Each structure stands twice: as structure tokens, then as C-alpha cells.
Amino acid sequence: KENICIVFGGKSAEHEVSILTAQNVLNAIDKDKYHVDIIYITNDGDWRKQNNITAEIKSTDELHLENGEALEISQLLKESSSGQPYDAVFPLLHGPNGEDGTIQGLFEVLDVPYVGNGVLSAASSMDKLVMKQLFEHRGLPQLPYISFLRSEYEKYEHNILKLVNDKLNYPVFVKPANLGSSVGISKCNNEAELKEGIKEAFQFDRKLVIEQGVNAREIEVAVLGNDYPEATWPGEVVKDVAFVQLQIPADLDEDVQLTLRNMALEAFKATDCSGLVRADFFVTEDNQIYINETNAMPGFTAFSMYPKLWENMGLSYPELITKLIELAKERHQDKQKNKYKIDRS
Amino acid sequence: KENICIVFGGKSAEHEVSILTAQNVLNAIDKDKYHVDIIYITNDGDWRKQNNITAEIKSTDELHLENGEALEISQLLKESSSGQPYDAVFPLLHGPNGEDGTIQGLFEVLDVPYVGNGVLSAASSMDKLVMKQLFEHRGLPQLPYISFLRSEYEKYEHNILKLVNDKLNYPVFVKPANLGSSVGISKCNNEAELKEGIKEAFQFDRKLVIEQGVNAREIEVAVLGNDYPEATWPGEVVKDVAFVQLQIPADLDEDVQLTLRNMALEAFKATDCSGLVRADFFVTEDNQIYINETNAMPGFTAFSMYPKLWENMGLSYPELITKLIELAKERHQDKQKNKYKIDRSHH
Ligand SMILES: Nc1ncnc2c1ncn2[C@@H]1O[C@H](COP(=O)(O)OP(=O)(O)O)[C@@H](O)[C@H]1O
Ligand SMILES: Nc1ncnc2c1ncn2[C@@H]1O[C@H](COP(=O)(O)OP(=O)(O)O)[C@@H](O)[C@H]1O
Numbered sequence: 001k002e003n004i005c006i007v008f009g010g011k012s013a014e015h016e017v018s019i020l021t022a023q024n025v026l027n028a029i030d031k032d033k034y035h036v037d038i039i040y041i042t043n044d045g046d047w048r049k050q051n052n053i054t055a056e057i058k059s060t061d062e063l064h065l066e067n068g069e070a071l072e073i074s075q076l077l078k079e080s081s082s083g084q085p086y087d088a089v090f091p092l093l094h095g096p097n098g099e100d101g102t103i104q105g106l107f108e109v110l111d112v113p114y115v116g117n118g119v120l121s122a123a124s125s126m127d128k129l130v131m132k133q134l135f136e137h138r139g140l141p142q143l144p145y146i147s148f149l150r151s152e153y154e155k156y157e158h159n160i161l162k163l164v165n166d167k168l169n170y171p172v173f174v175k176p177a178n179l180g181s182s183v184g185i186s187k188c189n190n191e192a193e194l195k196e197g198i199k200e201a202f203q204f205d206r207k208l209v210i211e212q213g214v215n216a217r218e219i220e221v222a223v224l225g226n227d228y229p230e231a232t233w234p235g236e237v238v239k240d241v242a243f244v245q246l247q248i249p250a251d252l253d254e255d256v257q258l259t260l261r262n263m264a265l266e267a268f269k270a271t272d273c274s275g276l277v278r279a280d281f282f283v284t285e286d287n288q289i290y291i292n293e294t295n296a297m298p299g300f301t302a303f304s305m306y307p308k309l310w311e312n313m314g315l316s317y318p319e320l321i322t323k324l325i326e327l328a329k330e331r332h333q334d335k336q337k338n339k340y341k342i343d344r345s
Numbered sequence: 346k347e348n349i350c351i352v353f354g355g356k357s358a359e360h361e362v363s364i365l366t367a368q369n370v371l372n373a374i375d376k377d378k379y380h381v382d383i384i385y386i387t388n389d390g391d392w393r394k395q396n397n398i399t400a401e402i403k404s405t406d407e408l409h410l411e412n413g414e415a416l417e418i419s420q421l422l423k424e425s426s427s428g429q430p431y432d433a434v435f436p437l438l439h440g441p442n443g444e445d446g447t448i449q450g451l452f453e454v455l456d457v458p459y460v461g462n463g464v465l466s467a468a469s470s471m472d473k474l475v476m477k478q479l480f481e482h483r484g485l486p487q488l489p490y491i492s493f494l495r496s497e498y499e500k501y502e503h504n505i506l507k508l509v510n511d512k513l514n515y516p517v518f519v520k521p522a523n524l525g526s527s528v529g530i531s532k533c534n535n536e537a538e539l540k541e542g543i544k545e546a547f548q549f550d551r552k553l554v555i556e557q558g559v560n561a562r563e564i565e566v567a568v569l570g571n572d573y574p575e576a577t578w579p580g581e582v583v584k585d586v587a588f589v590q591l592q593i594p595a596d597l598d599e600d601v602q603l604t605l606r607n608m609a610l611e612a613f614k615a616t617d618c619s620g621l622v623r624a625d626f627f628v629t630e631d632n633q634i635y636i637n638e639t640n641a642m643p644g645f646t647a648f649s650m651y652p653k654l655w656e657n658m659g660l661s662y663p664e665l666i667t668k669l670i671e672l673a674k675e676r677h678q679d680k681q682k683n684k685y686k687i688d689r690s691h692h
């Protein structure tokens with residue numbers, strides 16, 4: 001029997017999705033094969049541990065949450081309540097406080113084997129600009145964009161707006177580079193607008209992307225692997241306007257589907273991901289494809305896109321979960337073979 | 346008065362150099378400005394805290410702590426000897442177990458303010474391939490190079506070897522992407538030597554970079570700041586054979602030295618550094634410039650290049666230290682000041 005720990009919660013108000021996912025994930029683990037502990041991270045940033053989940057979880061009362069063992073962050077986060085080192089820890093708490101990448105650093109320092117993206121790829125995909133430079137270098141098509149720091153806008157305001165207006169068709173989107181799923185995003189149909197959208201954006205962040213806008217369907221691909229990743233067929237959110245229901249496989253040409261699969265595999269490598277990523281694309285009417293973002297820790301509930309896409313290929317939710325754990329162990333072991341092989345030269 | 350923590354050691358090859366640097370920093374720090382605590386981390390993850398340093402440490406063996414404050418990592422970083430949170434934690438230690446950016450991660454999670462680069466920047470400057478992609482997008486000159494993963498190498502050996510000849514000129518250097526200033530590196534004068542190098546490196550790493558060897562000088566620039574960084578004049582690492590000794594300022598003509606100062610500033614932004622970076626360049630006898638690498642946590646001894654290049658601009662070692670601490674404060678306060686603003690607006 002193996003030992004697992006699910007870390008969840010977080011400082012965010014994406015807190016409650018984090019609890020739901022924890023629930024789904026716990027109930028899809030075969031307790032006859034896995035010893036599971038969980039750690040909950042409060043809004044205020046405290047860590048609470050509950051030991052040895054063995055029953056099914058029918059609701060949130062059954063989670064102790066804030067009233068677990070007040071846990072000091074320590075060597076012990078490596079130790080399971082069976083008495084044994086954790087074979088894998090599963091962080092289900094999106095892009096924490098500071099940034100994604102941070103908690104993965106905590107685990108690396110503590111030498112705890114964890115599921116998913118490591119530091120570079122989790123950090124790089126929380127940063128919209130770096131992410132875009134890596135996809136460009138990998139050759140992936142993307143909408144036209146411009147970026148700059150606050151300090152650069154403070155002394156080249158005329159130049160920057162000329163650049164926008166010259167290489168970019170309104171409407172454009174202003175996006176803070178370092179926040180996910182959030183604030184400072186504004187549609188700008190003209191320079192007056194643009195100018196205040198940037199002003200708006202810079203109350204929250206030091207770094208912006210300005211992006212040319214399109215009408216597209218949003219299409220998504222799940223990938224799973226370490227060195228030999230595999231990609232799903234794509235799926236989409238079922239709608240008639242780009243201005244919850246899901247279509248898997250997405251309604252698209254056979255070839256557009258292959259292309260998107262391959263792009264997703266290339267996007268995975270561009271960021272040097274481990275475990276998983278979800279690659280999200282914009283696909284226009286005449287099938288022009290643009291990569292929008294990769295997502296290092298995507299929605300992972302029972303009905304989340306990322307799980308449903310693997311269901312399309314006969315990998316059920318529990319098997320997905322087991323597979324992510326084996327990929328976590330594989331990865332931790334190759335690191336230790338290298339950390340050792342290194343030290344002996 | 347302000348509360349500071351020096352955290353030094355590691356599990357690393359450079360463990361003693363980390364101790365040496367701790368002594369350097371502890372002695373230049375004005376104990377009439379800062380209360381100072383120290384966290385020793387041995388090559389066993391045996392974190393040890395010692396409070397309130399107010400003495401001018403003579404040997405580097407004083408820094409081999411026999412014991413820590415009993416508490417766990419979390420208690421040791423969230424409170425200073427004085428009881429309030431730290432103004433600034435100064436990591437003088439690489440960050441072992443999957444290398445740099447990790448200990449920063451730790452500090453972010455405990456919400457502790459710290460000196461030097463962030464997660465993304467410390468991680469990027471350790472991945473030579475990602476670093477190189479950011480320098481390229483930014484417009485900086487680089488030596489011809491080819492990168493690939495182990496799996497690409499097992500699928501397509503031939504075609505890559507072909508490319509190496511089609512693009513590079515021997516001798517080439519084979520470099521692992523993710524190991525630090527470490528082995529697995531090699532010059533390779535021919536395809537048989539390249540073949541072995543691929544092999545040697547793949548034992549330590551799953552991703553490599555092959556780069557055109559050059560003949561050039563080793564020329565380094567020191568950068569300091571957050572959003573409004575400044576760069577020093579260059580210095581040269583002086584050696585009759587590349588396979589210690591500094592000339593500050595470097596014997597280079599003026600526009601060249603002007604070009605490198607600005608190139609350092611661009612390198613700092615390509616990787617989105619904070620606090621400091623040391624930009625390393627290759628300059629040919631023909632005054633041809635290529636950036637080799639940036640270094641997020643350069644040597645920081647009293648004799649090291651980075652500190653010395655600041656000395657040349659009139660910023661002494663104690664001031665330099667005081668300045669990295671203030672930068673670490675501004676950057677923490679800035680983050681937190683954005684956090685509250687984000688929380689505030691409810692559309
Ligand atoms: N260039 C664009 N064209 C059309 N819609 C966009 C564009 N950029 C962003 N959006 C819309 O805003 C949403 C958020 O942008 P995205 O880049 O996905 O950032 P995040 O999802 O990290 O907040 C997207 O789902 C998309 O519909
Ligand atoms: N392409 C090259 N041509 C000539 N010399 C090189 C080349 N690449 C590396 N070297 C030498 O090897 C040394 C170490 O490698 P470097 O690229 O600086 O990374 P690191 O210090 O992380 O090992 C350098 O000090 C440099 O002088």
C-alpha cells in the first residue's frame with residue numbers, strides 16, 4: 001500500500017474550488033491501495049493536517065479543514081501518518097501566494113516528491129510574457145503582441161503607443177503579465193481606452209502584455225507525461241458565441257485536431273513541463289490556430305475539462321490520478337539518480 | 346533598528362565558499378543598524394539558527410554551528426530574535442535539491458522578504474536553454490548554438506549531428522542545461538568527442554545545449570536594483586588559459602564598455618531579475634560581443650567580482666549590503682501593496 005498527501009486550500013478565494021477538487025480526488029482514490037493524509041492551507045496561510053482518509057467524503061462538514069493538527073512546515077511534511085515517507089504529494093491549490101512555482105520550491109527544498117510541474121515550468125506559465133517568448137521560440141503561432149515594464153512606459157509612452165497602433169489592430173487587450181484568471185484585463189478599442197487600461201493595469205502589476213484581439217472558439221488539450229508525453233483529442237466549451245457544457249471531441253476537422261494535439265505536445269516541451277499541462281488555443285472561423293496559454297495546474301474536478309478529456313481516451317479519473325502519482329515517483333527518482341550520479345564524479 | 350537573517354551553507358560543492366561568504370557579510374554589516382541572526386544549513390538539511398550576532402568573527406570555523414534553535418524551518422524564518430518578522434533574509438547558499446529558485450519559493454510561502462532574485466528569475470538563469478531563449482527574444486548577441494532533450498536525441502541522433510556540422514564550427518562546447526557551474530561540460534574538437542560528450546552529459550541531465558567555442562575575453566558587469574536598475578563598468582577575469590584574478594576596470598575601449606553596460610541592463614530585464622545580477626560576456630580581440638550567461642547569485646566574497654565592480658563605482662561592501670536589503674524591502678512592500686489593491690476592487 002502507498003502513501004499520498006493532498007495539499008489544498010490556499011490564501012485565494014479560489015479556495016472553494018480547491019475544496020471541491022480535494023473532495024473529488026479523495027473519493028476517486030482506492031483506499032485499499034493508498035494511505036492518504038491531507039493538508040489544508042487557510043486563507044490566513046496556516047497548515048492543517050488531517051490523517052488517514054478511509055471513508056468516502058459526502059460533504060464539507062466531514063473535512064476538518066482549519067481544525068486539523070496545526071502543522072509546522074518542516075521535515076515532517078515528508079512523513080506520512082502510516083510512519084512512512086510520502087510516495088507522492090498532490091498540490092491542488094492553483095497559483096498560490098507570491099506565484100505558482102513557490103510551493104514546488106518548498107517541496108524541492110524538503111525533498112518531497114510531488115505531482116505536476118516543477119519550479120521553472122509552473123513559474124514560467126504564471127508569467128504571460130515569458131510563456132509567450134518560449135512558444136514563439138518553439139515556433140508556435142500566437143496572436144500579435146507587445147509587452148513592456150512600467151519603467152519602460154514611464155519613459156517611452158509615445159513610442160509604445162505608436163508601436164501598438166502600428167503593429168496592432170484595435171481592439172487590443174491589456175493584460176498584467178503575472179496574475180492569473182483576474183484583474184487589470186481590459187478591452188480597448190482605441191488609444192484613449194488603451195491608455196487608461198494600461199493605467200488601470202499598472203495599479204496591480206509591473207509588467208504588461210498588450211494583445212491583439214480575435215473572435216475565436218476556445219479549444220483545449222490535456223497532456224500527460226514526463227519525458228514521453230501524450231496528448232488528448234481536443235474539446236471545447238459548448239456555445240454559439242465567444243462574445244458547465246463541454247464538447248469532447250471538439251467539433252472540428254480531423255486534421256485541425258491532429259495539429260492541435262501536436263501543438264500541445266510542443267507547448268508542453270516549450271515550458272519543460274512535468275506530469276501534466278492543459279494547452280488552450282483560439283481557433284477562428286477559417287481554422288486559424290493560435291496558442292493562448294498553457295496551464296500548469298488546471299481544473300481537476302470530476303467534471304473539469306482536463307479530467308473529461310482523458311476520459312475520452314479511456315483513462316478514467318481514478319486511473320488518471322494513479323498515473324499522475326507514478327509520474328511523480330518516476331520524476332523524484334530520476335532526480336535522485338542524477339543528484340547521486342553527479343555527486344560521485 | 347532592523348532585523349536581518351543570513352542563511353548560508355547548503356548541501357553543495359560550494360558549501361565552504363558559502364561559509365566564507367557568511368563571514369565576509371557578517372563582518373561588513375553595521376551591527377549599529379541591524380540585529381542579525383544566522384541560519385546554518387549543512388550538507389544534511391540540518392538547519393541551525395544562532396541569534397543576535399554582535400561580534401567580529403575571526404575564523405571561518407566559528408560558522409560551523411554545533412546546534413540550532415530547536416524549532417522547525419517555519420518558526421526559524423517567520424520570527425527574528427527580536428520577536429517581529431524579518432525586514433530581510435539574505436540567502437548566501439545556492440538552494441540544493443532541484444537547485445536555484447527553490448529556497449526563494451520557500452520564502453514566498455512563509456511570506457518572508459528576501460534579498461536577490463525571485464523564483465522565476467533564479468530558475469531561468471539556471472536553465473541555460475531558457476535563459477538563451479530570453480536573451481534571443483530581447484535582441485542580445487549569442488554564439489551559435491543548438492539545444493535538445495534526451496528523447497529528441499534518442500529519436501534523431503543523426504539529424505542533430507548533421508545540424509551541429511551544418512550550423513556550428515568545431516570545437517563546440519557540450520553543456521548540460523540544468524546543472525550549475527559544474528561538470529558534464531566539455532569542449533569537443535570532432536564528432537567522436539561530441540558523441541561522448543552528449544553521453545557524459547546525459548547521465549546528469551535530460552536536456553543539453555551545444556555551443557560554438559570562441560576565443561574571447563571573459564568580461565563581467567554587475568547590476569543592482571529592482572525596477573530602475575544600474576550597471577557597473579565591466580571588469581575582466583584575467584587568465585592566460587581558460588579550461589582569483591580580476592582587472593577592474595577592464596582594458597576595453599570606451600564605446601565597448603558603454604555597449605556592455607547597456608547590454609547588462611537588457612539581460613537583467615530579459616530574465617526579470619530583482620536585486621542583482623552579474624552578466625557574463627565574451628569579447629573577441631576584434632571587439633565582438635556575446636552574452637554567455639547571467640548569474641542570479643554570484644560570488645559575494647569581499648574579493649569577488651560582483652562586490653569589487655561596485656567598489657569601483659564608489660559603493661563599498663558595507664553599503665552594497667545595505668542596499669541589497671533595502672531593495673529586498675521595497676520589493677516585498679511593493680508585492681504586498683499590489684495584493685491589497687487587487688483585493689480591493691469588486692466589479
Ligand atoms: N486576444 C484575445 N482575443 C479574444 N479574447 C481574449 C483575448 N485575450 C483574452 N481574451 C479573453 O479573456 C479571457 C482571459 O484571458 P486569458 O489569456 O485566458 O487569461 P487568464 O485565463 O489567465 O485570465 C479569455 O478566456 C478570453 O476569452
Ligand atoms: N563557447 C565557449 N567558448 C569558449 N569558452 C567557453 C565556452 N563556453 C564556456 N566556456 C568556458 O567554460 C567556463 C564555464 O562555463 P559557463 O558557460 O560560464 O557556465 P558555468 O559557469 O555555469 O559552468 C567559462 O568560464 C568559460 O570561460
Ligand SMILES: [Mg+2]
Binds near residue numbers: 526625638
Ligand atoms: Mg560561468
